[model samples]
Target: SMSVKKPKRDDSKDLALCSMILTEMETHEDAWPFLLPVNLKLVPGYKKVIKKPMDFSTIREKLSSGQYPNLETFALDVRLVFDNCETFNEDDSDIGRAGHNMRKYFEKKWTDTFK
Candidate 1:
């Protein structure tokens, strides 16, 4: 049967925009620290500090696997990467600066793309 009055809470357009935004963030120079899960071995106290460890790779997986029920759920995970950084690092540290930069870029793209 052909398409007929199909409707779903999960908007395809919104998902597309998220996917595009993800690529842009991944390519950002400061994305290195967030590309993958934190090395728990490298940072012994990471798990204790960042209660929920999230990263770009995790987001990508959730996007590809349809685990994200909505755009806001996806946004929350992306924001976590930056939020955790702020909590764990000094404002003047390299990673801290990167977190602020990435957050700014993501918000700008979110506003312009979804508006």
Candidate 2:
């Protein structure tokens, strides 16, 4: 058998779209709590509760470095960030409130643009 090359099967536009949305999220007013990793000391027992730690910065890196092959993969990580936030923070908590708003903002964008 001869070696065969694969045809292009990419979603370049989705990548750009994801970048735009992620940029917006990073700059959002309430992104402070999610821009960077949680300070273990400040939020004691955080690592114990959150199984997978993710943040805007981390996602940015993943997107930039091409770790996310497509929109589906990237979307999952983004939702994971929101899920973790809601799981750990209470609705009455200020950061939790921010998380909900941020997720709502992102979900609409995702739905409008990609879904």
Candidate 3:
């Protein structure tokens, strides 16, 4: 008979990337596209889509399913969008500009929070 050993769980090791994603999203939408890809790489099993016309519904479904074990893994994908902003072209600034505006809005919110 073969014996199987269970892997140890480390709760002390923080998995606060989801919170990081929320903070970044609240603070910097301009960088969302870049951050998403980088984050997908960090979590196991999430794949990157290199081609055009990304199907957002599919992504949302995957996240809803919680296939990556925790909210952090899903949030990491969003973070990657921010991390890899340069991969997207600046010539088409519509989405990028919107992201920039969103970032500004969040910055204002943060400033107001302190007042």
Instruction: Tell me the whole-model lDDT of each prediction, alpha carbons only.
Output: 0.92, 0.91, 0.44
In lDDT terms, how accurate is model 1? Answer: 0.92
Off by over 4 Å in 3: 1-55, 101-115
Per-residue C-alpha lDDT of model 3 across residues 58-101, encoded as one tens digit per residue? 33445446555664455445434433332453635865665455
Give each model a TM-score: 0.88, 0.87, 0.36
Q: Whose TM-score is higher: candidate 1's or candidate 2's? A: 1
Query: What digit string (tens of lDDT, one per residue) describes model 2 on residues 1-115?
Result: 3788778655668888999999999999999989999987788879899999999999999999989978989989989999999999999999999999999999999999876
Q: Write the per-residue lDDT of candidate 1 for residues 23-100, one digit (tens) a residue.
A: 999999999989999998889789888899999999999999999998889999999999999999899999999999
Worst ten in a row by lDDT for model 3: 50-59
Kindly indicate the candidate among 1 and 3 with the higher lDDT: 1
lDDT of 2 at 80: 90
Name the regions of candidate 1 deviating beyond 4 angstroms. Answer: 1-10
Backbone clashes under 3 angstroms, per model: 0, 0, 19
Candidate 3 Cα deviation (angstroms), residue 92: 7.7
